[PDB]
Design a protein around this ligand. Structure first.
Ligand SMILES: Nc1ncnc2c1ncn2[C@@H]1O[C@H](COP(=O)(O)OP(=O)(O)O)[C@@H](O)[C@H]1O
Ligand SMILES: Cc1ccc2c(c1)CN[C@]1(C(C)C)C[C@@]2(O)N(C2CCC2)C1=O
Ligand SMILES: [Cl-]
Ligand SMILES: [Mg+2]
Ligand SMILES: [Mg+2]
Length: 265
């Protein structure tokens, strides 16, 4: 339906593994959006066609203020183009680089917005599986929006695709290649809450092999400035046994969250 000729392309918004994302304007409507570009040759050698179909199918059917919209796609001889909602305030990754650490109020507010979006996802038995700061975007009023559904699926699930990037956000069950479910996103939420308050994720290390060891043994410690309440919530999320991880409703009702968040559920 859409073709490249229908858009004026502007500045690069960011880069992905596959994914070179550009600002764009549809010529007839002047609608401003983002165009995620992927090279067919690369997708073909990686053999990830099935993941790309999921990304479009899942994200296009989702409707929630804290989830980035995907409006459709087109392709030509060499590329695939995903048509996305434009997020004008950048990534949470950038904001963390800018400030080093977030205060309690900013952290609790982001966690509420994340928990709200994940709650909507899990009600449809969708799991995201790639929650991390570079995949969290910011709207015009500074509100958090979950993006990048390339790894998402319907639960329960195994894993039929090789992990390439960082282990930092993955739970023990996913790393050890065991069966997994929705509780994976709750572990990642714990990792994020720690990284927001401290400046770095709790299992970070110099080698893949050693990060693997720290994750599977759940070895993490807190700096002195992390408060009693934040410690409580984080320790409840980072449980080795996934059934012991809280429901999202319990996250949204945690005393430390409700005391510090400027957003409702
Ligand atoms: N809709 C968007 N608005 C603004 N920036 C974006 C948007 N989508 C992606 N980006 C930027 O491009 C980067 C890569 O996009 P992403 O969809 O995560 O690609 P990949 O699947 O390769 O990780 C993001 O981390 C962000 O910096
Ligand atoms: C969202 C989306 C998922 C899958 C694919 C497209 C778009 C682009 N169309 C096809 C054509 C029809 C063969 C089908 C395809 O699998 N694909 C991939 C090869 C690498 C891109 C293509 O070229
Ligand atoms: Cl398709
Ligand atoms: Mg990404
Ligand atoms: Mg992707």
């Amino acid at each position: 339906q859409w073709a490249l000729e229908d858009f004026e392309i502007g500045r690069p918004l960011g880069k992905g593994k596959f994914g070179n994302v550009y600002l764009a304007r549809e010529k007839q409507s002047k609608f401003i959006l983002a165009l995620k570009v992927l090279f067919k040759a690369q997708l073909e050698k990686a053999g990830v066609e099935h993941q790309l179909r999921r990304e479009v199918e899942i994200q296009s059917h989702l409707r929630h203020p804290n989830i980035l919209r995907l409006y459709g796609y087109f392709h030509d001889a060499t590329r695939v183009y995903l048509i996305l909602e434009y997020a004008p305030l950048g990534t949470v990754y950038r904001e963390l680089q800018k400030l080093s650490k977030f205060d309690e109020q900013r952290t609790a507010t982001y966690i509420t917005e994340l928990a709200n979006a994940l709650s909507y996802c899990h009600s449809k038995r969708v799991i995201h599986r790639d929650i991390k700061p570079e995949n969290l975007l910011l709207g015009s009023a500074g509100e958090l929006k979950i993006a990048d559904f390339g790894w998402s699926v319907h639960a329960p699930s195994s894993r039929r695709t090789t992990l390439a990037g960082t282990l930092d956000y993955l739970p023990p069950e996913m790393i050890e290649g065991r069966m997994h479910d929705e509780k994976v996103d709750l572990w990642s939420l714990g990792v994020l809450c720690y990284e927001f308050l401290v400046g770095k994720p709790p299992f970070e290390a110099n080698t893949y092999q050693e990060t693997y060891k720290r994750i599977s043994r759940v070895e993490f410690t807190f700096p002195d400035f992390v408060t009693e309440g934040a410690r409580d919530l984080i320790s409840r999320l980072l449980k080795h046994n996934p059934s012991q991880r809280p429901m999202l409703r319990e996250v949204l009702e945690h005393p430390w969250i409700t005391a510090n968040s400027s957003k409702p559920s």
